[PDB]
Amino acid sequence: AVALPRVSGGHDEHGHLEEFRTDPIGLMQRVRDELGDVGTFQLAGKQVVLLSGSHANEFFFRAGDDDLDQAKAYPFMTPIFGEAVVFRGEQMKGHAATIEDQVRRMIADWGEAGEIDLLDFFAELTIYTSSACLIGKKFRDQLDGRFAKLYHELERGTDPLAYVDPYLPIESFRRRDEARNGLVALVADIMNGRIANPDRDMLDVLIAVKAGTPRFSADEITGMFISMMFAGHHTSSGTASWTLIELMRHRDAYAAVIDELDELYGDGRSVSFHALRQIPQLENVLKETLRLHPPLIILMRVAKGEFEVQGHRIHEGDLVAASPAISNRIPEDFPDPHDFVPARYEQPRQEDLLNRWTWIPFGAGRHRCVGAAFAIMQIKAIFSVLLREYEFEMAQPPESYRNDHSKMVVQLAQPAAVRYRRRT
Numbered sequence: 001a002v003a004l005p006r007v008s009g010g011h012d013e014h015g016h017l018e019e020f021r022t023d024p025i026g027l028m029q030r031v032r033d034e035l036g037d038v039g040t041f042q043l044a045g046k047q048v049v050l051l052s053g054s055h056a057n058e059f060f061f062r063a064g065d066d067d068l069d070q071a072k073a074y075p076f077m078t079p080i081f082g083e084a085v086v087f088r089g090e091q092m093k094g095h096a097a098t099i100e101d102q103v104r105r106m107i108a109d110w111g112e113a114g115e116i117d118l119l120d121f122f123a124e125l126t127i128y129t130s131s132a133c134l135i136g137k138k139f140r141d142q143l144d145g146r147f148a149k150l151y152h153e154l155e156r157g158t159d160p161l162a163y164v165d166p167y168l169p170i171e172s173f174r175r176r177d178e179a180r181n182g183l184v185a186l187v188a189d190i191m192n193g194r195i196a197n198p199d200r201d202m203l204d205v206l207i208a209v210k211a212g213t214p215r216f217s218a219d220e221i222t223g224m225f226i227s228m229m230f231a232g233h234h235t236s237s238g239t240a241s242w243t244l245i246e247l248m249r250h251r252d253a254y255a256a257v258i259d260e261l262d263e264l265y266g267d268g269r270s271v272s273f274h275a276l277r278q279i280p281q282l283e284n285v286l287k288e289t290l291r292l293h294p295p296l297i298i299l300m301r302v303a304k305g306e307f308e309v310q311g312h313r314i315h316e317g318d319l320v321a322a323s324p325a326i327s328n329r330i331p332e333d334f335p336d337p338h339d340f341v342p343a344r345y346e347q348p349r350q351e352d353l354l355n356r357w358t359w360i361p362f363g364a365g366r367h368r369c370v371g372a373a374f375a376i377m378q379i380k381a382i383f384s385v386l387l388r389e390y391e392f393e394m395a396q397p398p399e400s401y402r403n404d405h406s407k408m409v410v411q412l413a414q415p416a417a418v419r420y421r422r423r424t
């Protein structure tokens with residue numbers, strides 16, 4: 001009957017929802033600043049118990065699906081995956097080679113010098129890497145920029161208003177729904193193309209299954225492919241963007257990465273060899289970029305039961321959340337937490353390893369990211385190519401690069417303009 005501590009503000013119609021839709025990171029920080037390790041905010045009719053700090057995070061991440069339910073906290077993903085999506089080491093070398101090929105293909109028309117937008121570039125690139133690795137090169141080769149454009153609209157369909165109702169007549173939801181129909185149409189044209197113009201991939205596997213009448217429709221197959229690509233797409237896309245931004249903002253780090261790439265590749269081995277082995281300075285830049293710009297800024301659960309955390313009672317049906325955005329910057333755990341300090345991961349400090357429950361850009365415990373090794377390899381492969389072929393400079397003030405946090409799916413904001421010039 002005791003109310004949990006509640007953060008200030010949230011006097012709008014849906015409580016803190018409006019703030020969560022505009023500045024979720026400031027809201028979550030205020031929870032911690034006012035209340036400490038366990039505090040709440042109101043998301044429309046739902047209480048969110050926001051945990052932070054080592055002890056509370058440990059509870060969150062060590063909880064089994066019996067205690068804290070992940071999938072129930074994401075009902076808004078239903079219109080994205082669709083009705084019927086009811087939610088290896090031996091391959092990695094091949095995937096690194098695939099990634100190298102996709103990056104070379106993306107920069108093939110760059111020429112001597114030019115300008116890119118990082119969101120446009122990395123969003124499209126990572127559609128190709130994800131589709132090629134997860135579904136097949138044959139399928140990627142039947143994709144072009146339209147698939148990326150549509151997939152982006154789908155991701156933009158995750159306004160937190162979806163916690164009120166995911167089918168409200170707002171434009172972002174209408175565009176989410178239309179984008180999904182557009183993706184189904186692309187997949188149907190691909191299926192038809194294969195009939196008329198017959199080396200196999202997962203799409204071939206799915207087409208072959210019989211109910212015989214074919215078992216799966218374009219709609220069903222498309223939902224499967226959307227779901228397969230979702231976790232790794234915006235996360236990898238944003239991380240690649242922020243990696244390049246932070247290298248440009250910190251030229252000393254950029255210079256060290258260049259030297260090391262040039263030294264490492266001097267053994268004559270491929271990207272598929274080196275992307276699976278240490279590239280130390282780049283890896284520490286990546287760790288720091290993830291600490292500062294975690295693409296998942298909040299992680300949601302529904303409590304299945306009663307638990308106590310620091311003498312605060314969580315009850316069944318409470319939404320319960322952790323936040324990499326906030327936890328990754330706890331100043332007692334990460335000295336100078338707003339500063340970009342790749343040295344914090346060198347053997348002497350290992351701040352990622354020592355702070356097991358608060359360095360959480362890839363989660364922790366029971367829910368440690370199963371895609372982390374792939375995502376890390378993919379950054380290594382991408383930058384092994386980009387940084388050896390081209391030099392990059394910022395085309396706008398360094399502090400003006402920023403994320404759009406208005407949707408549950410975080411995206412780099414535009415402009416994110418960067419110039420390149422061939423390395424001599």
Ligand code: HEM
Binds near residue numbers: 296
């Ligand atoms: C840089 C890219 C990525 C980041 C920052 C990231 C982040 C995370 C985070 C924060 C969690 C914990 C989720 C939670 O506790 O609710 C997680 C778990 C997970 N991620 Fe990722 N992820 C990335 C890429 C990927 C990729 C490429 C895949 C696979 C295609 C993937 C699949 C998963 C899976 C299967 C889990 C386990 C969920 C659980 O058991 O709790 N992720 N990831």
Ligand SMILES: CC(C)[C@H](NC(=O)C1CCCCC1)C(=O)Nc1ccncc1
Binds near residue numbers: 158409
């Ligand atoms: C947070 C996003 C809305 C999105 N979440 C999801 O796609 C799932 C919803 C239900 C099952 C858990 C996650 C997502 O991209 N999640 C992940 C991305 C990565 N790695 C792990 C999860």
